[PDB]
Design a protein around this ligand. Sequence first.
Ligand SMILES: [Mg+2]
Ligand SMILES: [Zn+2]
Lengths: 68, 36, 56, 125, 71, 99, 53, 69
Amino acid sequence: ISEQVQNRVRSGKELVGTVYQKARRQPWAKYNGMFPYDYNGPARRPAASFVDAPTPTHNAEVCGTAYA
Amino acid sequence: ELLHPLPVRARKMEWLKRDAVEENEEILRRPYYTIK
Amino acid sequence: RYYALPHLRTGPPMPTTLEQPSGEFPWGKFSTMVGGTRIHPLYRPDGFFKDNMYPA
Amino acid sequence: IRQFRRYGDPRYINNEAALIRGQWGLITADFGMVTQSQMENARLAILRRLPRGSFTLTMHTDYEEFPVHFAFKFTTGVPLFEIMPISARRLNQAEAEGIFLAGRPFIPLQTVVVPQGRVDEYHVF
Amino acid sequence: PRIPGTAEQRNWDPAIPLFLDDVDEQGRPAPLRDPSAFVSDTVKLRDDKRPYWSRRRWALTDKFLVPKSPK
Amino acid sequence: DSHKLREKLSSRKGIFVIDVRDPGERKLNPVPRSVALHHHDLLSGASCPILPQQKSAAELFVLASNESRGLNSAAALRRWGYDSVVQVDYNTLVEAGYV
Amino acid sequence: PQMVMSRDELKLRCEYCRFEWIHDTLCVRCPAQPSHDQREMWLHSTWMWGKQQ
Amino acid sequence: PVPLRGHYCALMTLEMAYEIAKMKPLCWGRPEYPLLETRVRRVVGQARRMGVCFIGVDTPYSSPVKDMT
RNA sequence: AAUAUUAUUAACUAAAAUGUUAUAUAUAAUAAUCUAAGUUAAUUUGAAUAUUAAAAGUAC
Ligand SMILES: [Mg+2]
Ligand SMILES: [Zn+2]
């Protein structure tokens, strides 16, 4: 959501459409180190669930690759 | 000397001792008799 | 002897007209821009040499 | 006279929140023992950073000296130095603290800079 | 007794009420014609850090403090 | 008692009056339908089972000599969930024909 | 480079001085006047457990 | 400056300040602007800053008039 | 009381609720495009100093 908000809001700080890109990509310059979720695992969030879904008729039938 | 920390579940059990003690004192503040 | 506070006969619990001066050094949130300033991006100040030189 | 090792023990936390008459002040945050020579070093180092035209440094030395060698046994919240104005010059916090910053290192225990009037010890501590 | 607990329990524990008869428990009687409003319990989980990603806020947030281990 | 009178006459039956009052004067005065409690015997919670079950529906009369223990026993009652409590002294329920 | 005790004791002394990351260790580099370089004192870039705590 | 010394230098009336301030406009094309009553204070305050004592101001009274109560 | 001296230690067979480990560690969010001058080079200290040598800092 946030990056889409960054895209559709006007360009006052940085260059759009131009090939310069004032802020240059520097992945190696950034933080190299492990966070506590790199050890203990990704933080637990509630599993995404479907409430009150209608019962699965045709549960025995297989879906055809839908290219048709 | 005591060197390594107390594990977490030990002091959890100690907390349980605390509110066991408290559970006792609530009983102790109840009246001597009851009018029925 | 046991010691206990008097009741409240009149007026507020926390002294209003009797306030002690608060002991921090009083730097305004907008005078020193650091944090706690929630300013809508429409209202952003002090751009006089950057974007507020070409206003509206 | 001929006081034992346990005497005038600084270790308690005091109830007196000091009142500093000077515009700014330097106040003991911990317990400890301070030598006179350390406070003299602090005083000189602070007098280097003062505008002697507008200001005067007041040092509170009137506390008892305890045998070790004679030094001071300081409780939390005991004021040490005071910046007193001779004129309308009003320092900020950054400036006053920048001034006391010179003399802080010579003092062996932690100190806080406090503004005129009574120590607000809710904010300091 | 009509008074719960012993004397030792009474002067240990501020739960058991004062059993004073003809006076109000707290000073003189309250007038007949909210502590948490001023008491702050807000537990701050993550300690707020110092803004190194901004040059001016870095130096304006300066803490003038000297680390001292107890002697 | 231009209100209280019809309240205590025929509005219901009753044992409605808890008197917390000295044993000396309850022999002198006596109101002979009231349950004679002790004010300590109320606050303590030793009277709870004889006090009525439904907490909201009840309204109880505290009959006290010194009004200070009337005010004490009111709080004693609302501690156990009795909010409607009316403080009455002896002479009041004389005109109400309750004695 | 001089090693400051912690991040708070770290200041930008010049116009050209920058904050940079040396593998999770925060440091200050000036492309001009290298004597302004400051490291936060912290663990070595390579450390084992028994070797470094 | 006064605190540097502890005594004022020469007395001056606000009459003189106007004929100092008359001479410096913003734009000689239009002498009226900026207005004297405002920009005089710049002169007054700079003289102030110089250590000049004043009459209208910084002393309670105005220089005596011979002929009037 | 009367007398005598002194400078952790598990029958046997089972049951049994108290061992394992909570390790130091915090990131994203600056490369930072745009601009004429105008009390004023205040005054003092200084050979000089004009916001940035010292002094003095509630003039406007
Ligand atoms: Mg200069
Ligand atoms: Zn540098």
